[PDB]
Scaffold this active site. Sequence first.
Site, PDB file in Angstrom:
ATOM      1  N   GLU A  11       0.772  -1.238   0.000  1.00 34.78           N
ATOM      2  CA  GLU A  11       0.000   0.000   0.000  1.00 34.78           C
ATOM      3  C   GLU A  11       0.793   1.272   0.000  1.00 34.78           C
ATOM      4  O   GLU A  11       0.271   2.301  -0.410  1.00 34.78           O
ATOM      5  CB  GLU A  11      -1.025   0.057   1.191  1.00 34.78           C
ATOM      6  CG  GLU A  11      -1.984  -1.123   1.245  1.00 34.78           C
ATOM      7  CD  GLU A  11      -3.066  -1.068   0.202  1.00 34.78           C
ATOM      8  OE1 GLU A  11      -3.044   0.038  -0.476  1.00 34.78           O
ATOM      9  OE2 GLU A  11      -3.863  -1.971  -0.011  1.00 34.78           O
ATOM     10  N   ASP A  20      -6.430   6.928  -4.937  1.00 36.19           N
ATOM     11  CA  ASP A  20      -5.931   5.591  -5.114  1.00 36.19           C
ATOM     12  C   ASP A  20      -5.887   5.233  -6.592  1.00 36.19           C
ATOM     13  O   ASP A  20      -6.013   6.121  -7.427  1.00 36.19           O
ATOM     14  CB  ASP A  20      -6.507   4.532  -4.156  1.00 36.19           C
ATOM     15  CG  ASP A  20      -7.909   4.105  -4.472  1.00 36.19           C
ATOM     16  OD1 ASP A  20      -8.384   4.717  -5.498  1.00 36.19           O
ATOM     17  OD2 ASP A  20      -8.549   3.311  -3.825  1.00 36.19           O
ATOM     18  N   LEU A  32      -8.921   4.062   2.882  1.00 34.64           N
ATOM     19  CA  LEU A  32      -9.874   4.730   2.020  1.00 34.64           C
ATOM     20  C   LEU A  32     -10.714   5.696   2.807  1.00 34.64           C
ATOM     21  O   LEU A  32     -11.322   5.350   3.835  1.00 34.64           O
ATOM     22  CB  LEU A  32     -10.808   3.717   1.351  1.00 34.64           C
ATOM     23  CG  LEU A  32     -11.899   4.399   0.513  1.00 34.64           C
ATOM     24  CD1 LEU A  32     -11.390   4.689  -0.892  1.00 34.64           C
ATOM     25  CD2 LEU A  32     -13.083   3.480   0.418  1.00 34.64           C
ATOM     26  N   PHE A 104      -8.475  -6.545   2.939  1.00 35.08           N
ATOM     27  CA  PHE A 104      -8.138  -5.163   3.251  1.00 35.08           C
ATOM     28  C   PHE A 104      -8.321  -4.302   2.013  1.00 35.08           C
ATOM     29  O   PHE A 104      -8.829  -3.201   2.033  1.00 35.08           O
ATOM     30  CB  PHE A 104      -6.646  -5.178   3.679  1.00 35.08           C
ATOM     31  CG  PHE A 104      -6.113  -3.842   4.102  1.00 35.08           C
ATOM     32  CD1 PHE A 104      -5.679  -2.927   3.156  1.00 35.08           C
ATOM     33  CD2 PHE A 104      -6.040  -3.479   5.452  1.00 35.08           C
ATOM     34  CE1 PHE A 104      -5.150  -1.695   3.563  1.00 35.08           C
ATOM     35  CE2 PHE A 104      -5.518  -2.254   5.873  1.00 35.08           C
ATOM     36  CZ  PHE A 104      -5.062  -1.354   4.912  1.00 35.08           C
ATOM     37  N   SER A 117     -13.218 -19.420  -6.425  1.00 33.21           N
ATOM     38  CA  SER A 117     -11.876 -19.383  -5.829  1.00 33.21           C
ATOM     39  C   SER A 117     -11.872 -19.893  -4.416  1.00 33.21           C
ATOM     40  O   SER A 117     -10.930 -20.552  -3.984  1.00 33.21           O
ATOM     41  CB  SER A 117     -11.351 -17.965  -5.763  1.00 33.21           C
ATOM     42  OG  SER A 117     -11.118 -17.549  -7.076  1.00 33.21           O
ATOM     43  N   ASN A 132      -7.438 -19.350 -11.772  1.00 31.03           N
ATOM     44  CA  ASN A 132      -8.737 -18.777 -11.680  1.00 31.03           C
ATOM     45  C   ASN A 132      -8.674 -17.326 -11.187  1.00 31.03           C
ATOM     46  O   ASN A 132      -9.378 -16.462 -11.655  1.00 31.03           O
ATOM     47  CB  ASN A 132      -9.551 -19.615 -10.677  1.00 31.03           C
ATOM     48  CG  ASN A 132     -10.938 -19.056 -10.462  1.00 31.03           C
ATOM     49  OD1 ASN A 132     -11.160 -18.241  -9.581  1.00 31.03           O
ATOM     50  ND2 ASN A 132     -11.895 -19.403 -11.305  1.00 31.03           N
TER      51      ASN A 132
END
EC number: 3.2.1.17
Length: 162
Positions: A11, A20, A32, A104, A117, A132
């Site tokens: 990040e 972002d 955020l 996150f 998944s 996948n």
Amino acid sequence: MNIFEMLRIDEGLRLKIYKDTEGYYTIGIGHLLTKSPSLNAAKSELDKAIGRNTNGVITKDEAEKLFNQDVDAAVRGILRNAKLKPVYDSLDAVRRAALINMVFQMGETGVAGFTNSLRMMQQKRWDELAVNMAKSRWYNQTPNRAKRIITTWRTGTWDAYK
Ligand SMILES: [Cl-]
Ligand SMILES: [Cl-]
């Protein structure tokens, strides 16, 4: 290596409000603020989050406080989620960190939707899973990060982060 170090790499750290990769107002370590288009709205969210008049700038210590809270919320989020908890409980320590990272980034809801998944994760079909997961907007929008996460899922080591 651990979850904090891992997300810190993914990040980065910024002390001033920024946009972002999706254009949303963010600050610190991937925190955020709002999806809304307005900077003022973002500045208000920031003041509310920090508890003071920031003027759009925070300190390192404040960024780390938001990060601690964010990681804790992701974990608890996972553990309260019907679809996510069982997956998490079935995994080894490195892969649990990979799941946390994803949550996150994209939220509980986003991850909980990778239905196929999730099944593979549980069946521990690593190679199938990696293929996948790459068929996703997520991978197409932030490929380098997604590749790091995918390798993590595939190998069960921190090699991508070293
Ligand atoms: Cl907050
Ligand atoms: Cl990327």
